[PDB]
Amino acid sequence: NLDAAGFLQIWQHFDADDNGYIEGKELDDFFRHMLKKLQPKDKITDERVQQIKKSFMSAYDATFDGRLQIEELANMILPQEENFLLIFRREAPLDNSVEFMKIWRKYDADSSGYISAAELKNFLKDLFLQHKKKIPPNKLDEYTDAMMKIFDKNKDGRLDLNDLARILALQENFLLQFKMDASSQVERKRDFEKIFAHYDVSRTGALEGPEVDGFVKDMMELVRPSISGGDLDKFRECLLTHCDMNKDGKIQKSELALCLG
Amino acid sequence: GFLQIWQHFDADDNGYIEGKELDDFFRHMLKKLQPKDKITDERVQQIKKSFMSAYDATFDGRLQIEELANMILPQEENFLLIFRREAPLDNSVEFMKIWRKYDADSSGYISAAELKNFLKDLFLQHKKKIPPNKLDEYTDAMMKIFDKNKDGRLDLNDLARILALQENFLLQFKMDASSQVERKRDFEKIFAHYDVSRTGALEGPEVDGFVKDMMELVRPSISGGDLDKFRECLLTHCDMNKDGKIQKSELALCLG
């Protein structure tokens, strides 16, 4: 029924304040609208707004914050064929943070801690080449602008680390599966080995480059909310200062075991 | 108990009801709904399609704690009363008053015990009496649901999400508004917003609101510890008379 442009008009109407979320009254207004569409004969009541809201939010509030962001509305009302946003989801889920950091380090090429309009443009260009589509330069500028407006939450014209994470549907923190109860020397060894094996994607017995980055992001996010690009470089340097004893810029298994106890 | 049901079926404690845990979960459901009915593979598969279409919001064919919570807890009128006020929470100073009151040990984090105190007071504000076991249950449920990194603590952005804090106040101001008259109107609108006690200084949760909102212009949602760090940083560089308050003159000086 609905197409990309008309989906946008509905998104723009209900994200009244253009802050990237259908939240509070925007969301009640959205679900009031929905009741009239589905049941025109029926009178809108607070009980029925709350019933249709529960129903749809349980199916489509994938981030569990009680708000709708553009992808969650797209899942609700936009047929897959017209979902331009589905360009960023592959056949394989992105569940290794090292593979994410390789993309972050490629496109944040200067390691400024942010992806600029120009850097995002390079990312979209390569993404179109991966789908063997050729996009004319003016259309590429258009797409870049649209994407920046959609995903730039604090409106500084830049994507942070957690903005690219959201765009690429980065999965959960690998380290959250490990348990405090696993207290036995044998269990501690099995977990250390499983952990190092996961980040050591090149299987060289050291964490190098985006392998360090994945480990630092995941480790820091055990104790604090999603970290920034700048924070990643700060805590990375902090881990190297305290654990890279041979100063080779790599974290050898022995160095990490030492630093942890 | 919601937690006991979660713990039973997430047998291997990996954060997901998946594979056989999920078929076992939906076998258990059939017996609850229709005790007289015999479990068959067709009926497990039919109830699974049905419930996963309604509740698998992440579309991964697994249940995580929030998806199970949606399935059982919003059926409880008193649990839903936790998430209802008439007025939107769109002033971060009002949010910080709640943060500072209930972070009672000033750890920069809300513990299970502190969250229990918050829910108790919330029920008193709605003149509802909740049985003690239901209060414990709601506290444990909330901890497990909203503790995203599983350290047994709620951070600042977790409480923000629980209270539906709206955070667009500084994002309304525009780079275009370059005229000395416009800069004054915006500065005054900004100070007036955080200066909730109308004393011409930012005191206590007024400084907190301003620091959270200002820091979140350039970085993702900040932590409780981050708040105390940047708060002391703002005082070190702007509190010229060293009274622990940010007078309008001090902030105008620090900004330009």
Binding site: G230 | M215, V218, C233
Partner: peptide, 17 residues
């Protein structure tokens, strides 16, 4: 040079200290 520019700059400076 709107007043939001000064806020952003102060935030960036404090976030780099």
């Amino acid at each position: 040079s709107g007043i939001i520019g000064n806020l952003r700059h102060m935030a960036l400076d404090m976030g780099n200290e």
